[PDB]
Amino acid sequence: WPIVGQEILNGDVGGGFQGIQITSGFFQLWRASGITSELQLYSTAIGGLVLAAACFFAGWFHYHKAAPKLEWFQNVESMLNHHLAGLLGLGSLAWAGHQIHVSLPV
């Protein structure tokens, strides 16, 4: 924001736009997803924010409406076979199927 001369931080990076250079590595990570215009990141952020709201909802729900018992928490068998198999295996298969059907543009 132009206030006290801080706008000098808007380094001339080209692309018809000036700003602060980022070293987080998000542009290279997004290029691997076939994004062609800015119109997609808006919807992606909308989805992420809805999921975060639902996440806080689930937290409140399992603390004040569905507070579990130690019998459920201590299901090491279930916790493993659902983290190891589901949370990891299903996610990896979904992301592999994604990379398979997005390998055309890149």
Partner 1 sequence: DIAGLTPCSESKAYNKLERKELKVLDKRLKQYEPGSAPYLALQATKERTENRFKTYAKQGLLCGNDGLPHLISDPGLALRFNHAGEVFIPTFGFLYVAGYIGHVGRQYIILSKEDAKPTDKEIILDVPLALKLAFQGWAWPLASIQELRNGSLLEKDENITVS
Partner 2 sequence: ATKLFPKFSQGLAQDPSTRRIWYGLATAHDFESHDGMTEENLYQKIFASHFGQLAIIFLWTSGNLFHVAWQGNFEQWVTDPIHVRPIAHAIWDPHFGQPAVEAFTRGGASGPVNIATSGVYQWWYTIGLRSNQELYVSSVFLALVSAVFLFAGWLHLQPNFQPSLSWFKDAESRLNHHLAGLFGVSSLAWTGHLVHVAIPESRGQHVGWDNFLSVLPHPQGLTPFWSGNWAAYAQNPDTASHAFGTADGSGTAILTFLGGFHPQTQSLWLSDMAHHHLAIAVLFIVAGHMYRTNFGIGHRLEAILEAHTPPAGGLGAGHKGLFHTVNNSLHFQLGLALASVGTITSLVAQHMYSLPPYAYLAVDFTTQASLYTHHQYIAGFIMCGAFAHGAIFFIRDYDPEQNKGNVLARVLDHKEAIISHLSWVSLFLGFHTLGLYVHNDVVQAFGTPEKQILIEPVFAQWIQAAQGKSLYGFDLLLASSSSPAYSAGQSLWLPGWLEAINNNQNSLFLTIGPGDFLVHHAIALGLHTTTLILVKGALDARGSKLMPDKKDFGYSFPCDGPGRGGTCDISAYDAFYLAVFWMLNTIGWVTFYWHWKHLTLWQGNVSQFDESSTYLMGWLRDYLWLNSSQLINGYNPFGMNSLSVWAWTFLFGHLVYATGFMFLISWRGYWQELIETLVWAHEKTPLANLVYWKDKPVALSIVQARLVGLAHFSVGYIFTYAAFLIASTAGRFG
Where do contacts with partner 2 occur on this chain (CB under 8 A)? 4-6, 8
Q: Report what 100 binds from partner 1, ligand CLA, partner 2, none; CB cut-off 5-8 Å by kind.
A: ligand CLA
Q: How far is the CB of 4 from partner 2 (least distance, A)?
A: 7
Locate 56 and state its tokens: 């806080």
**Among 18, 33, 78, 92, which residue sits at the site for partner 1 (rule: CB under 8 A)?**
18
Q: Is 3 in the site for ligand CLA (CB under 6 A)?
A: no
Side chain identity, residue 43: S
Compute CA 83 distance to the chain's CA centroid, rounded to the nearest angstrom.
19
In the chain, where does DSSP find H-type helix? 27-31, 39-64, 70-73, 76-80, 91-101
